[PDB]
Amino acid sequence: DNTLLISGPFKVNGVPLRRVNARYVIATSTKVSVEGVNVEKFNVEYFAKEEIKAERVEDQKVVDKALIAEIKKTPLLKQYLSASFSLKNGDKPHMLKF
Amino acid sequence: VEPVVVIDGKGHLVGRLASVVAKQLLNGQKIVVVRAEELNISGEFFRNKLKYHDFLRKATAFNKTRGPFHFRAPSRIFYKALRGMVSHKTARGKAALERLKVFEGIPPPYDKKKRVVVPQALRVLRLKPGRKYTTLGKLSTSVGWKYEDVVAKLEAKRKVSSAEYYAKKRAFTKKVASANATAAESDVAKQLAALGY
């Protein structure tokens, strides 16, 4: 549906498996190998409205373990992923390398 | 970029600074001008005294009390040049003029705050070396301003207090640099230098 499937991970910053639009997202340069993840199960019909449904909770726990293993490889990435991005005084987004 | 910008009027040109401030006032930026008695005007002293006398004789014939008001203070002379650069007869132009404060010397709390200059308005950066210039404080005294010695006495007292503050600040800054130099030769100092810090 032209959207992006994202994860925090939920254990790191509290952002679960969610769906967002690509136009409201700034893509940075930090890269993590996602070639250990079972993303093909999730699709458009997976996010159907029809509190929090119980079955999707363990899907969040089975996906985040495949990322936090590699997050611990590069130092300070876990603390980086738990910190909110913000613009400070003097910051110019037209020259800020992301 | 700042809530209130304090501009030091010393060494500036009355016309090039007013046009800078008038544009900033219309954009919604509050401007405070201090030391208006040290403003500079291009041309010799006799040129500007004759120009003010031409302005001084302009008054309404049948009632002098409702004609052009010839203000003598250096702050108001700079204000008169700035007032004609703003559409002051409209509501938008009146609101811009309430964002401006001009004083002789450096008044209270604006004396404890940082003062800036306008690079495209300094006399040293616009005038050819050799051109004659006039000081606004001397010109105002020759046309009827009687507070030159009062401001000069208060300004001399202020500089003594600010010199004592700078001695404490300069000594404290040297103590900070000694601890920052000892912070070098460490792991966190070399890692910061790799990232341009």
Partner: protein
């Protein structure tokens, strides 16, 4: 009138039955484009020979480049101009890097010091000064002195901010 170029233009004075193969006059024209260069060529042949644009054609137009475009030379230029009163002849020397660049500054200098527009200046000759001490103007002699070093005892560097937090310094 613009950033100049140097052209060579050849007219022919179109053949009649009585006179085939004419003399093929040639000039060097300083202009911005080929259209003005051909126009200035006909303007001068109309001042020297019984020929105009309708009575002749342009055989060839070629752009002349500097042989050494990056070697500083001294150029002695003779000009004839029209003033508000009459016509006068000048000789000036310009120290520059090419014939085209030296001509470009001459039009700026002629307009600045004599109020002479482009339409009122005729370039008689642009010639190179081969030897030192053949330069006759003092403002060119100054830069031919041995071991020339001159400072700039003032520094107005341009700024980009309306406000600066330190007073500028003109050290140099």
């Amino acid at each position: 009138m613009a950033h100049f170029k140097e052209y060579q233009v050849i007219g022919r004075r179109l053949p009649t039955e009585s006179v085939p193969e004419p003399k093929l006059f040639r000039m060097r024209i300083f202009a911005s484009n080929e259209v003005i260069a051909k126009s200035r060529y006909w303007y001068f042949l109309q001042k020297l020979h019984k020929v105009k644009k309708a009575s002749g054609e342009i055989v060839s137009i070629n752009q002349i480049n500097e042989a050494h475009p990056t070697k500083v030379k001294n150029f002695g230029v003779w000009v004839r101009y029209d003033s508000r009163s009459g016509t006068h002849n000048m000789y000036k020397e310009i120290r520059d890097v090419s014939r085209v660049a030296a001509v470009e500054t001459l039009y700026q200098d002629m307009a600045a010091r004599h109020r002479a527009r482009f339409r009122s200046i005729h370039i008689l000759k642009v010639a190179e000064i081969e030897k030192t001490a053949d330069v006759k103007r003092q403002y060119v002699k100054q830069f031919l002195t041995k071991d020339l070093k001159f400072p700039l005892p003032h520094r107005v560097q341009k700024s980009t901010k309306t406000f600066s937090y330190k007073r500028p310094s003109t050290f140099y």
